[PDB]
Subunit: 287 residues, 3 copies
Amino acid sequence: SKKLLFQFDTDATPSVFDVVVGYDGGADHITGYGNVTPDNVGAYVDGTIYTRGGKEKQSTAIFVGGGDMAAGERVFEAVKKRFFGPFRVSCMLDSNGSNTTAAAGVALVVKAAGGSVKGKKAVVLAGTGPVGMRSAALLAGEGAEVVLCGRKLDKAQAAADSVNKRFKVNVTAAETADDASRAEAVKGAHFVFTAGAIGLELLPQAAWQNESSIEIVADYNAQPPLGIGGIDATDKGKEYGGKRAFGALGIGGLKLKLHRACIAKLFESSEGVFDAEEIYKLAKEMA
Amino acid sequence: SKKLLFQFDTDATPSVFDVVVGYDGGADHITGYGNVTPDNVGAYVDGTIYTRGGKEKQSTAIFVGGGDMAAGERVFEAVKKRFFGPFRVSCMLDSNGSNTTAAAGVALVVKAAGGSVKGKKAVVLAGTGPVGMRSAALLAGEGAEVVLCGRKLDKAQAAADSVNKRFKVNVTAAETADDASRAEAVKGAHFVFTAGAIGLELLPQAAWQNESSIEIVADYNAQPPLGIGGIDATDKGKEYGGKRAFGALGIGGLKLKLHRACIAKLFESSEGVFDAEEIYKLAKEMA
Amino acid sequence: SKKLLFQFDTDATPSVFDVVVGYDGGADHITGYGNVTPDNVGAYVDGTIYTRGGKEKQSTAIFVGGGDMAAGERVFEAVKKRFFGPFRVSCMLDSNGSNTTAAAGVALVVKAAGGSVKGKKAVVLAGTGPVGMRSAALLAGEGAEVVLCGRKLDKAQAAADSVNKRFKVNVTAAETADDASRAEAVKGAHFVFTAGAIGLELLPQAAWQNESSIEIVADYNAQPPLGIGGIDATDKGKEYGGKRAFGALGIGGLKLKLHRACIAKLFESSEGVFDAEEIYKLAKEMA
């Protein structure tokens, strides 16, 4: 049976980026919808679960995306709620790389740390965005003590609460209103991640290369000035003294291979649910 | 040339359901448009008749669908009106199974009745919806005396009027405002169809099993409580005493095979017109 | 890698005509977008340049279309503005045949004129439209002295100015509000083109067959009454004295093959730019 991927995007039109990776991941056909909401998605899902029977269902899958992570999560919950008994197909969530980027970043760092980050301290700068929140969740799942930083404590704590409730973890929030507070926040930390706006530096070279505790840094901003000063976007475990750096492009290469591989996994069963945890498990197999 | 199916849906976005079945029917590519009307479909049809020549024409086809059956009928008429001479492609009309479901159901009932229902009484309960009206039409075309029932007489009559004009038959209307009136309407009938809302019973076991005239019952509601009480949705001619029943899933199994086969037909010539008549003709060959 | 064509249409929905030709041109998959604008196309382009590395890039391409030619040009310029360094894919512009129909018509007329039309007078009746404007531009590029006629000097000069600024040529504009004036504008002309509204005659038989100077006439209206009286929609260099005529269908035959051929070229490298210049260069090779 032809592998059919139904792309439900919360934005006005479907992501061109997600279409290309979907074909490279092995979908035979991709049918996309924009403006998808928890309300209109149920009827779309009915179309995926009442048209094919038995083994054939694994040949149809769903991919929910768009730029707003919270909206994508609402649609993704409405999709899982529509399934009934054996009437379901595999589904995946990744809003603008919120899951695949974060999973690639954290898997690369955990691998470079020796396989475990349990009991160590990780600080996620500008962690209130999609990738920062998901990175915080996966790090907390690995047993790291995580601090999620934001410009205002209310937003940082609201992000940490959301993460804690969804993932059953205990991330801590912290307010870093300026450059100085971010330089402070990373003191004593073993792993530092920067998940801020494009073309914005959050951690100058001097703010990390002198901190003895810091073992590995990771940056998700691919456009100079980079989130982390002193590295190159293509760095992937490059050594700076006794520390290792992961630039946004090094992480991005794994994320692309990972996103592709996930789509392929959607068609190997009709019960897969690829959100943060499952995507991360695959990211560790591929890092 | 690749087999290209153009899906024109009268709803805001194209039916996911129709897309999967279309691909399982052999289309190599399906390109869908929502918000199609008699005014804008013309330009779309032009794109299908002026891009391929010779025998290559049969490799492009049109499928009109959506939830509003009358809206689809108006688009379908506008599509045919756009064709001229040999400048045409095969086309099919099916609004959420208006044609394919009704044809699968009536073909199975006529077959179980021994090939003819000529001169016998058929009653369609809650028959003002698409599948109810096309069922009434097909039954009337087979020579059956048909009573189309609705909660309000004017709606039932408007439904019968529509059927009678489109199909040149004389289906009669009746008001059945409650369970008591529905039970009465079936007295003396030979065939009974329930085409009511999902998850709603219209004819308890006691209202059909003790009526000697009733030979076969068919129900289009697959969600319990089923439209017909005392049967299972999977029933496909199962015997209840001297009567036979067809559940919504039993009919639906044939409907899926029929709908796929119709799509395949569209690419076999450039002059196919798959509306109630032709689809019902194929359903009888397949039942 | 599968050959992915991304269609950006400025109209509300993507052209069905362009989808069929794009698939017959060799695209493995076409993903179309309506309502594209200079502002929202940038993110669509990013999805084509950040998803495939190295030589896999030539397996993704872009096609800009829609009815409004100037709108298409703005989007096309925006697409090219988004590329940078090696981060690019081939792109094509053709707004309802604006480039492929005019390229087909001009190339046919030039070939029939002996291969050179420099120093000769060419008149385009009702050439304020896309095909008219592009035909006027290609003729100017060939060295002909071109006159672009419109019902009002007002829009005629605007069309001419648009052409001259875009292709660096010196097209002249003339107002022909009467049948009489159109008959007058062609006296002394060697080549005449009619690019008027569908089903409208611009140049009656008696207005071109008795004019000594006229060598070839070309008409883009395929629906009777034709723009040029006395010919047949299918003439492809047919003789009517020492003269020759190209009807819209004769020209359209080459336009189809040319448009398919351009699509195939988009997948041979990631640096192709198919606008009037390159399309015409291929049109001459194929005429």
